[PDB]
Amino acid sequence: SANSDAVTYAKAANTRTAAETGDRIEWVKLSLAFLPLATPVSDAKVLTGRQKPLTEVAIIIAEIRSRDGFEGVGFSYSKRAGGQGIYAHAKEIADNLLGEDPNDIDKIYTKLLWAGASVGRSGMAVQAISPIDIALWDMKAKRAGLPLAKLLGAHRDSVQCYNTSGGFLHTPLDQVLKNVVISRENGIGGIKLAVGQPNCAEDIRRLTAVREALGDEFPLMVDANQQWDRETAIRMGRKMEQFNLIWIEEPLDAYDIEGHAQLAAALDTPIATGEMLTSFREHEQLILGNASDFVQPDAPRVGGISPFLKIMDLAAKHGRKLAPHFAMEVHLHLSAAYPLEPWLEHFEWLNPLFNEQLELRDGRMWISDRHGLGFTLSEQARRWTQLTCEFGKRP
Amino acid sequence: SANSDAVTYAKAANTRTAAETGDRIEWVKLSLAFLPLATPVSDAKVLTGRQKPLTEVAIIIAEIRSRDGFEGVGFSYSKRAGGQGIYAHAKEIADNLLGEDPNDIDKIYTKLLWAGASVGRSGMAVQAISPIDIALWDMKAKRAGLPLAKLLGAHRDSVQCYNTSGGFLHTPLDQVLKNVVISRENGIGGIKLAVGQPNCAEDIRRLTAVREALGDEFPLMVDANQQWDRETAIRMGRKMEQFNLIWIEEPLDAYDIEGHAQLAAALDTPIATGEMLTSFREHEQLILGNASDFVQPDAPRVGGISPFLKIMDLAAKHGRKLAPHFAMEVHLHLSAAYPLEPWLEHFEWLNPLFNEQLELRDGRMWISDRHGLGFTLSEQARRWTQLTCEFGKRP
Ligand SMILES: O=C(O)[C@@H](O)[C@H](O)[C@@H](O)[C@@H](O)C(=O)O
Ligand SMILES: O=C(O)[C@@H](O)[C@H](O)[C@@H](O)[C@@H](O)C(=O)O
Ligand SMILES: [Mg+2]
Ligand SMILES: [Mg+2]
């Protein structure tokens, strides 16, 4: 009998609790490095005078070591001003990590938010938490002896990949075409052309020239970087229907929800946006407002893997596709865990930071058998480091 | 420099892929057992004539072993008819598990759903997937060398606990009071009284008597098991405002969303419901309808841990508290991962199925250091097995 007239309580032997036997964070190292770009990069934002050419990328790295011998590495970044503040805030809160059980990632995330309650739950502050949140996930995966994608649960072992770095606006049409062949010869699965420059006639020129070389089937997409007004948007979009694009990215201001929704409803061509958003809440607004067919969150920018997962689930409920922005070293795993077939964006920019490189085969990026994110920092990463600080003591 | 006038591509050395190195399921064992209840249990569902007293509990157990030596165990249950069906379906689809990477839990779930597409994505079919889904989560946690709660990431190391098995309707008042003392003496953190019997006057008598015995502060709650109609629910609700209960559980039919919402808005006392729901979508309709203050999902009933996690995220997003129903062996880990302070429900019924017992101290149930769920099947569980089948070959 499993019961009786009166209630009965059992007795346990192993009185050891998970609280007293868990691992503990003992050391943390933060670094602010700068990825130099010999060739200044220009997208529509530069062509319209909104910003100056990009000449480098700030990278904020977090390395965490546990008492039991596990290590996690993660990073956040900034294109243009932001790296100094992200590093500074991370440095002012990292101390809170010492002594915590590295497995309670969200409990830690919460403690970090409370420590910086005055500066919000979105934007820079959470971007200061991203490298730490990502390092903790990296650690958990390693603890389990699995690539991050497998710790989360994968739906695919590889992800379609397209290249962006070779289609910017500071690049003459002839070079863009030269980059296309190089990219295809290397097994890229798609090409994204940066558009949205004052001269609309030119973007059409450059765009028609690319579609010609690639043929009719090769996945092609465009990105206006928020440089069109509603009128131009629908106009250009309606005209671009003759390219069967995978998507039209950021046709309008990142916060113009109704404008994007309107565009998405008026065109068969999918609309993509969200890379500039810096929190789950911001992405939720775009999603509830049916702003786009493709959601493009950025783990470092939204606060790390933890918030990114929430964004993924929400997008999934609304049947939206996923096309993460930048940092493929982290997004490869996240997009591998997405229910619907995603797209991965490719840049070579971060390659020199790591000792390993991802495998690009037949239009797809394959997940290696390496644990966690599957990357180790290179000598170059240390050379490019300008500021660093440590907490605790190496176990 | 990290970039150039053209586009650059590196090359990967470590050519091994996660696809070719992942673990693989090689053996699966399913069992249908019956937990005997020598003392027939009856709540309001019996006193109103809807059902007959409960005399046993069906238990569907799944055991999975991987090529690399990992093992996982999980289960679902059925109070009254349903167990033969759950077992029958699990047996008809289990074979699909062989050769699958056990870490891709959602991927496997989807494959199992397609294997039985004809029978839906809710109800019995997912309750047949439950044992398997739970076993896989149990396996992943063990692979990481962590209690399930830590694999998920805990917000607490113990959870407030209340007893239910001592306050049922087939139990005379004085016996209930006796169980209360016994329960309180064993360190219980709360008491739930079964109400909703035809004689409303008699429940008030029992409720008053219990509140008197427990004192003013001790956590007390009631459960009507869907036996009131809207008129009675509100009437009993006003009348109970005085006892300052932690919550009023299932005052109406489990699918009367507007009814619950109306009671929730009308009363200060929290309203709880959800134990009868059998899928994420079902719970989602109640949550989007603002039906209750406390959401009470049942992992075995909703399809396992995977869907239970989505229910948690949805509930959290709407600021609702969590109070999982039954199966404390699994819910301890899930509730520990909930961001808002949850409640765990205690029954002794399943204690004999496992060799290990949970530690109850100071009104809370503590998570032990044992990995995965932290339970191994006892011999008594084998004694109570009526049917069983196996697939593959034990590695
Ligand atoms: O989708 C992308 O990768 C681009 O949208 C880049 O974020 C680009 O703006 C950036 O590299 C820049 O040039 O400012
Ligand atoms: O919340 C509870 O514990 C109850 O709601 C039980 O599920 C009860 O109905 C069941 O044990 C029964 O007697 O039918
Ligand atoms: Mg872009
Ligand atoms: Mg109940």
UniProtKB/Swiss-Prot annotation, chains A, B:
Cofactor comment: Binds 1 Mg(2+) ion per subunit.
Q: Could you state a single Gene Ontology molecular function term?
A: magnesium ion binding
Checking Pfam families in the record gives: MR_MLE_C, MR_MLE_N
| Cell wall biogenesis/degradation listed as a keyword | no
Q: Which residues bind Mg(2+)?
A: D223, E249, E275
Q: Name one GO biological process term.
A: galactarate catabolic process
The record's CDD domains line, in alphabetical order, gives: MR_like (cd03316)
Bilayer-crossing residues are: none
**What controls its activity?**
Competitively inhibited by tartronate.
Return the annotated site residues (Increases basicity of active site His).
D298
- Xref: InterPro entries: Enolase-like_C_sf, Enolase-like_N, Enolase_C-like, L-talarate_dehydratase, Mandel_Rmase/mucon_lact_enz_CS, Mandelate_racemase_C, Mandelate_racemase_N_dom, RHMD-like
Q: Which UniProt keywords apply?
A: Lyase, Magnesium, Metal-binding
Q: What happens when the gene is disrupted?
A: Cells lacking this gene lose the ability to grow on L-talarate as carbon source, and are impaired in the ability to utilize galactarate as carbon source.
The EC number(s) attached to this protein equal: 4.2.1.156, 4.2.1.42
Report which reactions are catalysed by this protein: L-altrarate = 5-dehydro-4-deoxy-D-glucarate + H2O; galactarate = 5-dehydro-4-deoxy-D-glucarate + H2O; L-altrarate = galactarate
Q: Where is the active site?
A: A194 (proton acceptor), H325 (proton donor/acceptor)
Query: What function does the entry list?
Result: Catalyzes the efficient dehydration of both L-talarate (also called L-altrarate) and galactarate to 5-keto-4-deoxy-D-glucarate (5-KDG). Also catalyzes the epimerization of L-talarate to galactarate; epimerization occurs in competition with dehydration. Is required for the utilization of L-talarate as a carbon source. Also functions in galactarate utilization. Is not active on other acid sugars.
Q: What else is known?
A: The enzyme product is the enantiomer of the product obtained in the galactarate dehydratase reaction catalyzed by OB2843; the enzymes thus differ in their regiochemistry of dehydration.
Q: To which protein family does this belong?
A: Belongs to the mandelate racemase/muconate lactonizing enzyme family.
Q: How does the record describe its quaternary structure?
A: Homooctamer; tetramer of dimers.
This chain's protein is named: L-talarate/galactarate dehydratase
Per the UniProt record, the source organism is: Salmonella typhimurium (strain LT2 / SGSC1412 / ATCC 700720)
Q: Where is the organism placed in the taxonomic lineage, from the top?
A: Bacteria, Pseudomonadati, Pseudomonadota, Gammaproteobacteria, Enterobacterales
